[PDB]
Scaffold this active site. Structure first.
Site, short mmCIF file in Angstrom:
data_model
loop_
_atom_site.label_atom_id
_atom_site.label_comp_id
_atom_site.label_asym_id
_atom_site.label_seq_id
_atom_site.Cartn_x
_atom_site.Cartn_y
_atom_site.Cartn_z
N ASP A 80 23.27 -24.90 75.35
CA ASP A 80 24.65 -25.35 75.10
C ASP A 80 25.64 -25.08 76.22
OD1 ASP A 80 24.03 -26.59 72.74
OD2 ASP A 80 24.81 -25.00 71.45
N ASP A 100 21.81 -34.36 71.13
CA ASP A 100 20.45 -33.81 71.02
C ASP A 100 19.99 -33.50 69.58
OD1 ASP A 100 21.50 -31.24 70.52
OD2 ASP A 100 20.81 -30.41 72.42
N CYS A 130 17.94 -20.42 68.57
CA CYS A 130 17.31 -20.30 69.87
C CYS A 130 17.76 -21.47 70.72
CB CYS A 130 15.79 -20.33 69.74
SG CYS A 130 15.13 -19.16 68.54
#
Ligand code: CA
Ligand code: CA
Ligand code: CA
Ligand code: CA
Lengths: 637, 637
Positions: free
Chosen positions: B334, B442, B616
């Site tokens: 990110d 995404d 994660c």
């Protein structure tokens, strides 16, 4: 454009179909679990292909054909004509299991086809063509396309919108849009200060055009009418290209689908048009004169008489203005610049106005209203069309006086420089004017057409030419010939050729000013593609101030009124030889053999002396170039 | 380039001649009054033509020829080689009156010829060529030219300057410049925050490179050394292209002439080079992986073990990072984006860093450090190279999640959008991500290469595919099959295929989310030139929040680790049929026939439940494209 529309498991789907698109349709998701095969029927005006793994076959309106149900076997659905009230446009899919040949379920797709096109005159002929395939782009050059908008330089009336650009939303369809759809015209926040759009919202109540898009209004819902319909919009530009604005703006129309309360509407179809806002273009001295504007004090009678006589030799009209409290004595030259804008089948002259302290002439002009002396429009010129090293500048190049990069000297304000650069079509060049007290390129250079030809000359002030002429006349026995005859406030100075030639400091000053002139000569030859055959040197002389800057010793003859073959040239008041001014005779000897006709215009006698300042101004409005600016291909930035 | 140098009346002129120019010389002004004709002599290495009315004739070193003195008869003076201490380079003009053949006066021109060229690698081979004729311009494409600069992404040392661009000032001449000349390198105020230039000012005292041009330094006087000399400069870019900056910068050198105290120096000769600053370029999933970076909590042991095992099947290296106080749990995905920059024969990876609250990995990377969730780099993707309607995008196109134009929804900050647009070579496209709570592209789409080919697939999340699979398994007798086996914090919910299929509101929510997915499908097919054969749909399911936005019901399988043929796919925890997850089996059945190898990676078991959030992150550094960005021809703006 292919658009996704899926059949729905255990329900019918109703959709709008926009002509020019087609649908790909998943039939597998709506199939009951355990279903094996499918078949289909469709109506007369809906075309259906079964597509499996990329291979498409057309299917009849009612066949019995069956295909295996697979995620990779889909429908492609096409319609070539808009729906009417006579239409039932549909595709029906039946599902079968292995057990038997009777359908176990069915999924429908009901369609309403409409045409929606936002149309502009992208091919630049003045008409609005139907759906130009290139309308969403803007390209330069002879083969280029995309629509052109004019800046507005001046409830609304249609007559008031006459100068604006037309944009037409063309639709075709049945009496109404299906439940849950609307059509919306819109622009970006960024473009909202660049454009405005006008439309008659309520045609049953009158012809009133209202502003529907622009500052604070980014979208407008437009009413759908059935059958073949056209909605007429008028579009205006609000500003010229500048440092942060390319000149391009976009307008969109979307068909929106209502989903549910609190959820945004979905953009089912979107159509876009682009406009370029037309640049401001300056007119060089070679273009045909239309009107001559002069300003002076009311009692400068000789100036007025002589300018009137000059203009009477031509087809030009003369416009006379006097002096104002808020403007300089030269204001028609210094504070006003005549230029033009053009769109297909419309254009007009547009004046840039930069008042010294902050009227007009005529309804025929648009007006754009906005520091050192380099900010004056006396410091702006534009060359005739030139070709430089194979690169054409069909509109010429703008010339702006400046100082050397490392000099710490004066420069025209960035706001104006950036404006001129952003118009792009005149590709500006900076010259060196800061060696002059006033600092204007029109103090040292001008262009004139050569009669009978398509060619032109650069005229340059030259101190070397003056010293050569004066030294010759002195050798000839004329050393005691006096300057400034008839100017009573000069008489006590007794200025003669002898007195000028013996002034040692003045010689040195003028050698330096000639270096400044020659530096400009070289830039002009480089950037305009000129040779020495394109240049004539006019005698000039300057005095130096405390800043080492130049002011005219006698009137600068280079800043002249150019009306084709006829040149109004400032009267120099040079030394008299055989009762003629030797400067006038020398200038005639340079210009007259080329077919140029010289008239000397006295603007200074009314003041009784000449100190380097000129108290009058002139400006000529000219016909625009025949070459259309949109046919140029400027260098990419 | 022709340059004006006049002989001076009653005095000698000394001038510097710069090779590559020539002089035009007025001999008439220096002639005494009453002089009739002139003759000339010149030295061996000076070439002289007498030019009358455009017609030029070469003249011998010592002839006796005479020409009539006329303002239109001038000299053209050329030199082909630089002066040395052995040189006496000169032209002498003698003047005659009518009376006799002995000269009545003489005017000289004494010359010192030098070579001055500011040189850069404009032909883009990594070497600095001598005076590339195109060095002052920058053109795109295979045949394009002009020099390239890298942004510095990291008294000075030469080793520290290794990554910068070379610029060489090449000179040739005698021991010293004539009295009153200096050479100065300079830049504009505007470019002063875009570039910096380093040079060894005092080479006799050491190799120390100092910053000579940049912020607050717009010019530097450089020392002239005689003979053939080179001065080496190193140039860096300070920033990437952006909204107000094209990426182009210029550097100039001028030969300046001293006039007198208090007067600016005259720019006798100026040479210019242009640089373009290299854009930041993003790498798509199809490019070869180099390193895999993962972040997670230290005790998520299964995730670490399974990622390690996946990477061991490849030639990639694994880099493991844990969680930080100032960053999100996904920060490596990110807050970090891997990209690269390239110049001829130099380039490296460059990471964009946007920390949540405000470390690194390796010296090998450059770093650029900078709100809603749409600002995350999870909301940026880049496509493989595509051709769309005949237009090639050899570097692919960047994809950015957004909302509908009229929606009032979220959008990535303008600063980032404008940055990505300004790089130009990846031509960004906005998609619709704002239907998702987190709002990242995404969450719904990814690209994968097809093994053994040059082709690729678009992977899309599909709720329709999930409902079809679950309805099939229910029909097959598996309705009571449970989701989330092994996640103890989910057990009390007893989620089964039956419970999912009977939830009426969830069905409706997911039909709506499928419309959102399909809207994106259509944009992607349009803007990437894709057909249905290029797309695979992976089963997905979402829950709706109070804002009508989606979060994953089970882990989103589309956001996967792509290492060539090997795909790390989030473990879905789907319903078990015959002791295998039916979601895993379905996904294998889609991907494996294409030669893709699937490994399911469990990042959620350590948390005992799945609420829609992933704890994660992964990011893959890839090799840059083989295609050089400067060979692209982007559309003009
Ligand atoms: Ca038309
Ligand atoms: Ca002007
Ligand atoms: Ca090279
Ligand atoms: Ca990313």
């Amino acid at each position: 454009r292919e658009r996704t529309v899926r059949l729905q498991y255990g329900s019918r789907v109703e959709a709008v179909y926009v002509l020019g698109t087609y649908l790909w349709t998943d039939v597998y998701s709506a199939a009951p679990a355990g279903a094996q095969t499918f078949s289909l029927k469709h109506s007369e005006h809906v075309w259906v292909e079964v597509v499996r793994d990329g291979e498409a076959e057309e299917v009849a309106t009612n066949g019995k054909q069956r295909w295996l149900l697979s995620p990779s076997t889909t429908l492609r659905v096409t319609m070539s004509q808009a729906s009417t009230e006579a239409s039932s446009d549909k595709v029906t899919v039946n599902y079968y299991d292995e057990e038997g040949s009777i359908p176990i379920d069915q999924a429908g797709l009901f369609l309403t086809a409409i045409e929606i096109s936002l149309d502009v005159d992208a091919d630049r002929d003045g008409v609005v063509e139907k759906n130009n395939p290139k309308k969403a782009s803007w390209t330069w050059g002879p083969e280029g396309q995309g629509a052109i908008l004019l800046v507005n330089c001046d409830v609304y009336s249609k007559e008031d919108l006459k100068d604006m650009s037309q944009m037409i939303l063309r639709t075709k369809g049945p009496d109404r849009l299906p439940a849950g759809y609307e059509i919306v015209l819109y622009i970006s926040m960024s473009d909202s200060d660049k454009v405005g759009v006008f439309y008659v919202e309520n045609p049953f109540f009158g012809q009133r055009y209202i502003h529907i898009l622009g500052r604070r209004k980014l979208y407008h819902v437009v009413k759908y009418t059935g059958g073949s319909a056209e909605l007429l919009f008028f579009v205006e530009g609000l500003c010229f290209p500048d440092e942060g604005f390319s000149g391009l703006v976009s307008i969109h129309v979307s068909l929106l689908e209502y989903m549910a309360q609190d959820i945004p509407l979905t953009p089912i179809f979107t159509d876009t048009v682009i406009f370029r806002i037309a640049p401001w273009i300056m007119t060089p001295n070679i273009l045909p004169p239309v009107s001559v504007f002069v300003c002076c004090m009311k009692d400068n009678y000789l100036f007025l008489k002589e300018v009137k006589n000059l203009v009477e030799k031509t087809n030009c009209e003369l416009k006379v203005c006097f002096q104002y409290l808020n403007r300089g004595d030269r204001w028609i030259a210094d504070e006003i610049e005549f230029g033009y804008i053009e769109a297909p089948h419309k254009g007009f002259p547009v004046v840039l106005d930069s008042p010294r302290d902050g009227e007009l002439l005529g309804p025929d002009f648009g007006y754009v209203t906005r520091v050192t002396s380099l900010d004056s429009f006396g410091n702006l010129e534009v060359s005739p069309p030139v070709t430089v090293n194979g690169k054409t500048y069909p509109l010429g190049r703008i010339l702006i006086g400046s100082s050397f990069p490392l000099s710490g000297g004066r420069r025209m304000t960035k706001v104006v420089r950036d404006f001129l650069k952003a118009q792009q079509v005149q590709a500006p060049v900076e010259l060196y004017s800061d060696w002059l007290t006033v600092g204007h390129v029109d103090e040292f250079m001008s262009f004139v057409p050569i009669p009978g030809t398509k060619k032109f000359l650069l005229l340059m002030a030259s101190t070397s030419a003056c010293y050569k002429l004066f030294r010759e006349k002195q050798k000839d026995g004329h050393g005691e010939a006096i300057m400034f005859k008839g100017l009573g406030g000069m008489s006590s100075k007794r200025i003669t050729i002898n007195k000028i030639l013996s002034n040692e400091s003045l010689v040195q000053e003028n050698l330096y000013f000639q270096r400044c002139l020659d530096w400009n000569r070289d830039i002009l030859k480089k950037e305009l593609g000129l040779t020495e055959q394109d240049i004539i040197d006019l005698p000039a002389l300057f005095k130096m101030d405390e800043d080492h800057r130049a002011r005219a010793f006698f009137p600068n003859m280079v800043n002249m009124i150019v009306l084709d073959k006829d040149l109004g040239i400032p009267k120099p008041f040079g030394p008299q030889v055989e009762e003629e001014c030797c400067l006038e005779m020398h200038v005639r000897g340079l210009l007259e053999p080329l077919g140029l006709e010289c008239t000397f215009i006295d603007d200074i006698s009314a003041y009784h002396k000449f100190l380097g300042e000129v108290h009058c101004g002139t400006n000529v409005r000219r016909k625009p170039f025949t070459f259309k600016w949109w046919h140029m291909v400027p260098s990419r930035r």
